[PDB]
Structure formats: structure tokens, C-alpha cells
Design a protein around this ligand. Structure first.
Ligand SMILES: Nc1nc2c(ncn2[C@@H]2O[C@H](COP(=O)(O)OP(=O)(O)O)[C@@H](O)[C@H]2O)c(=O)[nH]1
Lengths: 426, 48
């Protein structure tokens, strides 16, 4: 059938994918052990999309966890739902790529990545077809973006028709640590535009805005942030995983969102979201779901869509629902809100219906949107980049191992013309 | 003549005395939320 190979890179990718394998396993009725614990054929029939089978059950995830520092993958192993991964599906690595794109992409990553595509290859042609690759990683970090984006080009050149669907945490400039965030992010987006199919910009800062204002979490930890993203990560791969009235794979999303060859930086929002004691007060009809997923507070990327338009949007619904209540809501947002929707494209939204809701919630929505407002941080990280790069900022730790200065100006140039390409349709 | 007694302690032996060790055996016990029952049906099975 259809198959997804999930590769997680770096501390951020390993910890955000570990929660993903916690919420998929809850959805499929799999213990931390790995046995089924229900009675539902629908919960088990489309399991090969994320789990393999080994003799006496033991449904192992198709996970290729990989890092250059042996500090965060062991934390996945010791935690609950962490023994599911194979011991040889853990590409380790000593020393470390300490916040350097080059220490993951030219040296210290090139030696390890040979073993990484081995583990990828056994979990690629171990089946019959392949829908594509889910790649969680981090642009704001060395070992996350370095061998992260390198792997994006390696598995693209090996399989240049599979869907390269990547969840990346972009460095938002306002409140975030580590100073080399402009150099890692700008260099990694250049590799990410001709080698990835669906880059989902999921910032830490806007996730905090979801936690503080929507959920009203008093102390949102990093597990809270990864719980939100793992929910959006389950909602996009739903129709490969569960039946529905109108189905939509990942290749559906790429065709019905991307008008022109690059143009592939989307914004996600997931929303049965409610305040602390507001579960007794919220409705769960489609109109309140639609009014919530279009709220700018419900963006995982702080790249406010009112400061731009919607080039093409998509909403993959879930749960039991009626088709016209989808359709009239998808049409009413176009008729009422017309300024923040582009004109040269008609009917700027697709919809899908999964008939299997998430666990406990009766209805849910994920909203992947190709918006011409992502250039706000394509300017934000570029202004941070050129403020450093003019008067020769941290570069001796980016030059002595092999990059020349021309790769930095070309990475900023590809950033700049992609800003200009989004500003073309505005 | 008398002989005065010797009162003398060097600083290393005055303030680097073998200290009592801190008392540390405190695990962080974590619960697991029970898995919810799977209330979800196919539409084909629901009307047909
Ligand atoms: N979503 C998420 N973001 C994280 C996590 N850990 C760190 N980050 C973010 O990533 C940035 C640092 O990335 P880093 O861990 O150094 O990446 P790496 O070491 O190269 O793999 C920080 O600004 C954090 O906000 C995590 O577990 N989840």
C-alpha cells in the first residue's frame, strides 16, 4: 500500500518525533510495549504506513532517529513509549556538531550520513510502494539543520519522485536563544527549496502564543509545544491512515497547494483547542472550527496572514460530519473574507473528510496553508543574517572546515529571490 | 625557661574537612494516562 519513513534529526527533531510516536501509538492502540489493546479493524488495518511487523507482533515504528550527540536519543529511550524503536534504528554519534551548519553538512556529518542512508534504505525498499518521507528537524541548530538538510538532498537524489514532507522549526528572531540562528537558518533554507516538497514552518514562538493565549497554560514546557505539533503531524497523514468520505494523501496536498515550482512553505493550525475550563462551554460544530483555524492566534508560525494573502489553502477535517457543512463554511470564508485571498486563483481551498476522529475529540481540523505571508520571516531571518554578515560576524568557525564566503552570499541571494517571488503575488 | 604549647592549624586542614555527603535518592515517578477507548466508525459501515 502506502508507506511513510519518518526520520528525526537533532535534539529538536528527536524530541518532537518521540511525542509523534506517542500520539500515533495512542491512535492505533499500541502500548509502550507494542501490542494492540483494542478491538477495531479500522484502528489496525492501515498500520503499515508507520509501523512494521516482526514475528510475534511487536509493531516497531519506521523511525530513523539520528543525531551527532548521544544525549537526547537516550532520553527518548528511557522515557515512556521510547522502547518502541529498534536499537539499530538509532544512528548515534560522538563529539558533536555544536551549533554549526558546517559541522553537520561538510565535516562531522559526512562520515555519519553514510550509515544513515543505510538505515533509511532498509526501511525504504522493505515494502512495495513508498508515499514519501516525514522529516522532523531544526533549522536553528547545528546537528539538526546540517545533516538534516543534507539528508533531504540525499534521499531526494535517491528517490526523486517520493513526497519530501518536512516539519522544520524555523528560528523566530524575537525571543529565542543561540546566536548563530541566522547563519544556520539562511544556509539551510537554500538547501531546502530545491530538495523538499512540503516544508511546514512551525516556530517555537508562535507555539508559545498558542499556549499562552488559546490554551492558557501557566507553565508551557517543551513537551507541551511538541504535543501541539504532533497533533498537526497526525492530522495531515490521516487519509493514509483511516478511511473517510473524501480522502486526501500527501501527494494531494502538494498538487492542490503549490502553483509554481518553489512556493512550498506552509502554515499549520490544529483546533479543537479550548481554554482551561472551557470544555463545558465550547461547541464542536464546523463553523466554530473554521472560525478558529483562520484566527491568527491559531498559527504555528508567527507570520500573521492578515499581513499578506492566502495563495492557496487546505483544511483536512477529521471526525463524523456532513459534506455541505464543510462546503458552505469553506465558501463563506472566501465570500466574507475576500481581501486576504488571492484573485488570480479561483476557489482557493481544498477540503477532506476523515471519518475517524482523534482520540476523545469528536471533531478536529488541521489547516495547512500556502500563504504569501511567510516572507515576513524570510525577511526577519535575512535582516538578522545581513546585520551579522556585513561586519564579519561568527565565520572563522564556518570557514576553516571548508566553506568559502561565496556560499554565504549565494544562500542569502536564494533567500532574497524567494522573498521577491512571494512579493510577486501579493 | 618554659616551653609554650604549639597551637597551629593550616588553612587547608581547617576548612577542607571531610564534609557529610548530600542525601540523594529521589526518583521522579511519572504516571501514564490510560488509553482512551476507540470510538470511531467507518461511514460505509455506519450507513451501509
Ligand atoms: N519544538 C521543539 N523545539 C526545541 C526543542 N529543543 C530545542 N528546541 C528549539 O531549538 C533551538 C535549539 O536547537 P538545537 O537543540 O540546538 O538543535 P540541534 O542541537 O542542532 O539539534 C532552541 O531555540 C529551541 O527553542 C524541542 O524539544 N522541541
Amino acid at each position: 500500500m502506502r508507506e511513510i519513513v519518518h526520520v528525526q534529526g537533532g535534539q529538536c527533531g528527536n524530541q518532537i518525533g518521540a511525542k509523534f510516536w506517542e500520539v500515533i501509538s495512542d491512535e492505533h492502540g499500541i502500548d509502550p510495549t507494542g501490542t494492540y489493546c483494542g478491538d477495531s479493524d479500522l484502528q489496525l488495518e492501515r498500520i503499515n504506513v508507520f509501523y512494521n511487523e516482526a514475528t510475534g507482533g511487536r509493531f516497531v515504528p519506521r523511525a530513523i532517529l539520528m543525531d551527532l550527540e548521544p544525549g537526547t536519543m537516550d532520553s527518548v529511550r528511557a522515557g515512556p513509549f521510547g522502547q518502541l524503536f529498534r536499537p539499530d534504528n538509532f544512528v548515534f554519534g560522538q563529539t558533536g556538531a555544536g551549533n554549526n551548519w558546517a559541522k553537520g553538512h561538510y565535516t562531522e556529518g559526512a562520515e555519519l550520513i553514510d550509515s544513515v542512508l543505510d538505515v533509511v534504505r532498509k526501511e525504504a525498499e522493505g515494502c512495495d510502494c513508498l508515499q514519501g518521507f516525514q522529516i522532523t528537524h531544526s533549522l536553528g541548530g547545528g546537528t539538526g539543520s546540517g545533516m538534516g538538510t543534507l539528508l533531504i538532498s540525499k534521499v531526494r537524489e535517491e528517490y526523486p519522485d517520493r513526497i519530501m514532507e518536512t516539519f522544520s522549526v524555523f528560528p523566530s528572531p524575537k525571543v529565542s536563544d543561540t546566536v548563530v540562528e541566522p547563519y544556520n537558518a539562511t544556509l539551510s533554507v537554500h538547501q531546502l527549496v530545491e530538495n523538499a516538497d512540503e516544508v511546514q514552518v512551525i516556530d517555537n514562538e508562535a507555539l508559545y502564543d498558542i499556549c499562552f493565549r488559546t490554551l492558557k497554560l501557566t507553565t508551557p514546557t517543551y513537551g507541551d509545544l511538541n504535543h501541539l505539533v504532533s497533533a498537526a503531524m497526525s492530522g495531515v497523514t490521516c487519509c493514509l491512515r483511516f478511511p473517510g468520505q473524501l480522502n486526501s494523501d500527501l501527494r494531494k496536498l502538494a498538487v492542490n497547494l503549490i502553483p509554481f515550482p518553489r512556493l512550498h512553505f506552509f502554515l499549520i493550525g490544529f483546533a479543537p483547542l479550548t481554554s482551561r475550563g472551557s470544555q463545558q462551554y465550547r461547541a464542536l460544530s464546523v463553523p466554530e472550527l473554521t472560525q478558529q483555524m483562520f484566527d491568527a492566534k491559531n498559527m504555528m508560525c508567527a507570520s500573521d496572514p492578515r499581513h499578506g494573502r492566502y495563495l492557496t489553502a487546505s483544511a483536512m477535517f477529521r471526525g463524523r460530519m456532513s459534506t455541505k457543512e464543510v462546503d458552505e463554511q469553506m465558501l463563506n470564508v472566501q465570500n466574507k473574507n475576500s481581501s486576504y485571498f488571492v484573485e488570480w486563483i479561483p476557489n482557493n481551498m481544498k477540503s477532506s473528510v476523515c471519518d475517524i476522529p482523534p482520540k476523545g475529540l469528536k471533531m478536529s481540523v488541521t489547516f495547512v496553508g500556502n500563504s504569501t505571508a511567510i516572507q515576513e520571516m524570510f525577511k526577519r531571518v535575512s535582516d538578522q543574517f545581513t546585520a551579522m554578515f556585513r561586519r564579519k560576524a561568527f565565520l572563522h568557525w564556518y570557514t576553516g572546515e571548508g566553506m568559502d564566503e561565496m556560499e554565504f552570499t549565494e544562500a542569502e541571494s536564494n533567500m532574497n529571490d524567494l522573498v521577491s517571488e512571494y512579493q510577486q503575488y501579493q | 625557661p618554659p616551653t609554650l604549647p604549639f597551637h597551629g592549624e593550616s588553612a587547608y586542614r581547617t576548612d577542607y574537612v571531610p564534609k557529610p555527603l548530600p542525601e540523594v535518592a529521589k526518583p521522579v515517578e511519572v504516571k501514564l494516562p490510560p488509553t482512551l477507548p476507540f470510538n470511531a466508525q467507518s461511514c460505509y459501515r455506519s450507513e451501509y
